[PDB]
């Protein structure tokens, strides 16, 4: 009833490779809120701005018991380098095979260059403590975004 997106059951058990060398799963986050933000490419201007914006709000997400995950299809090593350079204190998922991206339907097509071109569309989601996707943002405008996500989280967590 309150879900805005339905994920295949298997999505929650996908092994998600993280920066730092461990794996997580969405089911492993049961019991707390999870923010999942998808971005197209490590170490580019918009993606760096977005990551820094979430990083600055980490104590506010903590106040709510929430965790954050950033997601792109860059490698674990790329993610480690991005986290170290920028000082990120949350993990990045290396979704190299785009399994998580496809589950959230963030791989979008554009007719460009006389081709059908597929790529990650910047998108964010709020996953409840019981694993429901209760809010989505697609074609994300980076400016103001992390603040808006935090506000929405607070409103939902009540
Ligand atoms: Na970087
Ligand atoms: Na969760």
From Swiss-Prot:
Domain of life the protein comes from: Bacteria
Domain Thioredoxin, residue spans: 3-158
Record GO terms (molecular function): thioredoxin peroxidase activity
Protein EC: 1.11.1.24
Catalysed reactions, semicolon-separated: a hydroperoxide + [thioredoxin]-dithiol = an alcohol + [thioredoxin]-disulfide + H2O
Pfam family, one: AhpC-TSA
Gene Ontology biological process terms from the UniProt entry: cell redox homeostasis; cellular response to oxidative stress
Positions of disulphide bridges: 47-83
Coiled-coil ranges (or none): none
Swiss-Prot/TrEMBL keywords: Antioxidant, Disulfide bond, Oxidoreductase, Peroxidase, Redox-active center
Active site: 47
Presence of the UniProt keyword Oxidoreductase in the record: yes
Enzyme class, first EC level, given as a word: oxidoreductase
Extra remark: The active site is a conserved redox-active cysteine residue, the peroxidatic cysteine (C(P)), which makes the nucleophilic attack on the peroxide substrate. The peroxide oxidizes the C(P)-SH to cysteine sulfenic acid (C(P)-SOH), which then reacts with another cysteine residue, the resolving cysteine (C(R)), to form a disulfide bridge. The disulfide is subsequently reduced by an appropriate electron donor to complete the catalytic cycle. In this atypical 2-Cys peroxiredoxin, C(R) is present in the same subunit to form an intramolecular disulfide.
Subunit organization: Monomer.
Protein task: Thiol-specific peroxidase that catalyzes the reduction of hydrogen peroxide and organic hydroperoxides to water and alcohols, respectively. Plays a role in cell protection against oxidative stress by detoxifying peroxides and as sensor of hydrogen peroxide-mediated signaling events.
Name the record gives this protein: Peroxiredoxin Bcp
Annotated source species: Xanthomonas campestris pv. campestris (strain ATCC 33913 / DSM 3586 / NCPPB 528 / LMG 568 / P 25)
Gene for this chain: bcp
């Amino acid at each position: 009833t309150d879900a805005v997106l339905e994920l295949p059951a298997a999505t929650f058990d996908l092994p998600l490779s993280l920066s730092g060398g461990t794996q997580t799963t969405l089911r492993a986050h049961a019991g707390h809120w999870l923010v999942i933000y998808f971005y197209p490419k490590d170490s580019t201007p918009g993606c760096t701005t977005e990551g820094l914006d979430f990083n600055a709000l980490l104590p506010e997400f903590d106040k709510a018991g929430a965790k954050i995950l950033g997601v792109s299809r860059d490698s674990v090593k790329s993610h480690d380098n991005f986290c170290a350079k920028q000082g990120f204190a949350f993990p990045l998922v290396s979704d190299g095979d785009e399994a998580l991206c496809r589950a959230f339907d963030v791989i979008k097509e554009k007719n460009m260059y006389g081709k059908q071109v597929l790529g990650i569309e910047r998108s964010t989601f709020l996953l409840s403590p019981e694993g429901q996707v209760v809010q989505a943002w697609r074609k994300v405008k980076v400016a103001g975004h992390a603040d808006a996500v935090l506000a929405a989280l607070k409103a939902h967590a009540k």
